[PDB]
């Protein structure tokens, strides 16, 4: 059960990362003052990765 | 003797039960690594539902 929990967590993380990276594409090259692009950075906390 | 036979049966039953365990009951012994090491998905899992 523990291993399954870990695996489902990992898979959900991957799916969400992929979807966010996909959505990120539409905001490429947006000119705002000196701003030229926007990104949603997604990461896994090491304290939680371990 | 009877206990040993029942134990053999029992061992077989638990090994069978395990064989259906994870990630989706299949040849997970090495299929796991063969699955994540490449950008693919298990067909049985794809047909899980």
A1 Cβ under 8 Å from any chain B Cβ? no
Record the tokens describing residue B15, joined without a space: 């090994």
Residues 6+ apart with CB under 8 A from A21: A42
For chain B positions 1-49, those within 8 Å of chain A (CB to CB) are: 22-23
Which of A29, A23, B37 lies closest to A42 in space, CA to CA?
A23
Q: Find out whether A17 and A42 touch, Cβ atoms under 8 Å.
A: yes
State the best of B18, B20, B22 to mutate against chain A, taking most chain A CBs within 10 Å: B22
Method used for this model? cryo-EM
A28 HSE (CA, 13 A, CB side): 6
Q: Spell out which residues of chain B touch residue A3, defining contact as CB-CB under 8 Å.
A: 22
Q: Note if the bond before B23 is cis, omega within 30 degrees.
A: yes
């Amino acid at each position: 059960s523990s291993k399954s929990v870990a695996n489902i967590i990992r898979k959900t993380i991957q799916r969400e990362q992929n979807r966010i990276r996909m959505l990120n594409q539409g905001l490429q090259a947006v000119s705002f003052g000196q701003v030229r692009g926007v990104r949603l950075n997604v990461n896994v906390r090491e304290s939680h990765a371990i | 003797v009877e206990r040993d036979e029942v134990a053999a049966q029992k061992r077989e039953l638990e090994k069978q039960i395990e064989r259906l365990s994870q990630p989706s009951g299949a040849e997970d012994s090495r299929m796991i690594a063969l699955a994540e090491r490449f950008g693919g998905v298990l067909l049985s899992e794809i047909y899980d539902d």
